[PDB]
Curated annotation (Swiss-Prot), chains A, B, C, D, E, F:
Interacts with MARK1, MARK2, MARK3 and MARK4. Interacts with PSMC2 through SQSTM1. Interacts with SQSTM1 when polyubiquitinated. Interacts with FKBP4. Binds to CSNK1D. Interacts with SGK1. Interacts with PIN1. Interacts with LRRK2. Interacts with LRP1, leading to endocytosis; this interaction is reduced in the presence of LRPAP1/RAP. This is Microtubule-associated protein tau. It comes from the Eukaryota. There is a cross-link at residues 8, 14, 18, 28, 40, 44, 50, 66, 72 (Glycyl lysine isopeptide (Lys-Gly) (interchain with G-Cter in ubiquitin)). Expressed in neurons. Isoform PNS-tau is expressed in the peripheral nervous system while the others are expressed in the central nervous system. Glycans are attached at residues 44, 50, 66. Phosphorylation at serine and threonine residues in S-P or T-P motifs by proline-directed protein kinases (PDPK1, CDK1, CDK5, GSK3, MAPK) (only 2-3 sites per protein in interphase, seven-fold increase in mitosis, and in the form associated with paired helical filaments (PHF-tau)), and at serine residues in K-X-G-S motifs by MAP/microtubule affinity-regulating kinase (MARK1, MARK2, MARK3 or MARK4), causing detachment from microtubules, and their disassembly. Phosphorylation decreases with age. Coiled coil: none annotated. It is linked to In Alzheimer disease, the neuronal cytoskeleton in the brain is progressively disrupted and replaced by tangles of paired helical filaments (PHF) and straight filaments, mainly composed of hyperphosphorylated forms of TAU (PHF-TAU or AD P-TAU). O-GlcNAcylation is greatly reduced in Alzheimer disease brain cerebral cortex leading to an increase in TAU/MAPT phosphorylations. Frontotemporal dementia 1: A form of dementia characterized by pathologic finding of frontotemporal lobar degeneration, presenile dementia with behavioral changes, deterioration of cognitive capacities and loss of memory. In some cases, parkinsonian symptoms are prominent. Neuropathological changes include frontotemporal atrophy often associated with atrophy of the basal ganglia, substantia nigra, amygdala. In most cases, protein tau deposits are found in glial cells and/or neurons. Promotes microtubule assembly and stability, and might be involved in the establishment and maintenance of neuronal polarity. The C-terminus binds axonal microtubules while the N-terminus binds neural plasma membrane components, suggesting that tau functions as a linker protein between both. Axonal polarity is predetermined by TAU/MAPT localization (in the neuronal cell) in the domain of the cell body defined by the centrosome. The short isoforms allow plasticity of the cytoskeleton whereas the longer isoforms may preferentially play a role in its stabilization. The modification Omega-N-methylarginine is found at residue 46.
């Protein structure tokens, strides 16, 4: 008797990760008339003043990919 | 008896990572009339003033890819 | 009796990483009329003043790729 | 009597046109298993066959801008 | 009497035209398994076959900018 | 009697045209398994076959800019 073995798996698979700030940011502060005036203020501790600024902070410790694949043909 | 073994797996697979600040930032501060005037202020500790500034901070400790593939043919 | 072994695996696979500031930054501060005047201010500790500045800070400790592939044919 | 005339108009205006194919095209034909087949066909006249092709055809005869501005100071 | 005439118009205006194929094209035809096959066909007239091709055709007869500005100071 | 005339108009205006293929083209045909085949075909007239090709055709008869500016000071 004749034997023919044809081991031809085809892998076209996609493993994909997109992580972080994906969307677009359109920030248009001002445009009209803006007055932020301050006269006589006294500060005993720390100040942050943010006027029309943008902070984008992105951390990606994750988002990695792992593909493990084993092909084995054992004959007799 | 005749034996023919054809080990021809095909790999076209894609493992992909995109991580961090992916999206576009369109920041247009001002455009109109903006006045941030300050007259008599007194500060005893640290000050941040941000006016129309952009900070983009991206950390990617992650986003790595790992592909392990083992092919084995053993005959008799 | 005849034996024919054809070990011809094909690899066209793609392992890819893109990490960090991927997206475009369009920062257009000012454009109209902007006045940041300050008259009589007193500061006892550190000051940051940012007016229309851009900081892009990117750290990529990650984003590395690891491909391990083992091919083995053993006969008798 | 003293005369002081101060002609200081400020123009910060934007006249802007964007015309044509503005949006992004993401065309991914195939992806799975596609078989297009034809055995015995006879054509007496013209044939177009399009399989996963993209045509983007853009005509912009318009989209032009016209700004006319006249400044005039006439004294006595 | 004294006469002082100050004629200091400021023009910072922007006239801008962007015309044609503005958006990005991402065309990824195939990707999976695509078979296009034809056996016994007969064509008496013209044939176009397009398989995964891209045609971008951009005509811009328009998109031009015209700025006319006249400044005039006339005294006595 | 004294006369002082100060004709100092300021022009920082921008006239700009960008016309044609503005956007990016990312064309990645094939990628997986593509078979195009044809056995016994007969053609009596002209054939175009496009397989994964890119044509970018740009005509810009337009997109020109015209700035006319006239400054005039006339005294007595």
């Amino acid at each position: 008797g004749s034997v023919q073995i044809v081991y031809k798996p085809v892998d076209l698979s996609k493993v994909t990760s997109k992580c972080g700030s994906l969307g677009n940011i359109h920030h248009k502060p001002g445009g009209g008339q803006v007055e932020v005036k301050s006269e006589k203020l006294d500060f005993k501790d720390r100040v942050q003043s943010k006027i029309g600024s943008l902070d984008n902070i992105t951390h990606v410790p994750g988002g990695g990919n792992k593909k493990i694949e084993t092909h084995k043909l054992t004959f007799r």
